[PDB]
Amino acid sequence: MCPKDWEFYQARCFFLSTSESSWNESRDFCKGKGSTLAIVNTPEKLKFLQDITDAEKYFIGLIYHREEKRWRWINNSVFNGNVTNQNQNFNCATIGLTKTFDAASCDISYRRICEKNA
């Protein structure tokens, strides 16, 4: 099983924060628990998380790469979905509330989803 307060899905463990912070701060929080920001790279994973996030927005492990002109998952794979409301300024993304991946400022405070192996 997962650690206390973490949630199991297909050999992986997920944590939904109540606290809000910036993307980098969220990266630091997840690392503080030996995890990384969530990679949500399949229909099944997106659905699993959307079902339990409900009505708040959460940073995940999806960032824009200036030098590539594409989004990438933080495990170094190309982004395989669509991000909404992109603009020259936003380099991060959230899920939750909406039905979609949504561009967000890396500097604005959001909750986070951390992920590690079970």
Swiss-Prot record:
Residues 1-118 are extracellular. Highly expressed in bone marrow with lower levels in synovium, lung and bronchus. Expressed in peripheral blood monocytes and in the monocyte/macrophage cell lines U-937 and Mono-Mac-6, but not in cell lines of other origins. Expression is down-regulated when monocytes differentiate into dendritic cells. Disulfide bonds join C2-C13, C30-C114, C92-C106. GO terms for cellular component: cell surface; cytosol; plasma membrane; specific granule membrane; tertiary granule membrane. Glycans are attached at N24, N75, N82. The keyword Transcription does not apply. The keyword Membrane applies. N-glycosylated. Contains sialic acid residues. It is a single-pass type II membrane protein. It is found in: Cell membrane. GO terms for biological process: cellular defense response; innate immune response; myeloid cell differentiation; negative regulation of apoptotic process; negative regulation of myeloid cell apoptotic process; osteoblast development; positive regulation of cytokine production; signal transduction. Keywords: Cell membrane, Disulfide bond, Glycoprotein, Host cell receptor for virus entry, Host-virus interaction, Immunity, Innate immunity, Lectin, Membrane, Receptor, Signal-anchor, Transmembrane, Transmembrane helix. GO terms for molecular function: carbohydrate binding; virus receptor activity. Residues 9-115 form the C-type lectin domain. Acts as a key regulator of synovial injury and bone erosion during autoimmune joint inflammation when its activation leads to enhanced recruitment of inflammatory macrophages and neutrophils to the joints. Functions as a positive regulator of osteoclastogenesis. Cell surface receptor that signals via TYROBP. Regulates inflammatory responses. Monomer. Homodimer. The majority of CLEC5A is expressed as a monomeric form on macrophages. Interacts with TYROBP/DAP12. The interaction with TYROBP is required for CLEC5A cell surface expression. Interacts with HCST/DAP10. Forms a CLEC5A/TYROBP/HCST trimolecular complex depending almost solely on TYROBP. This is C-type lectin domain family 5 member A. The lineage of its organism: Eukaryota, Metazoa, Chordata, Craniata, Vertebrata. The gene is CLEC5A.
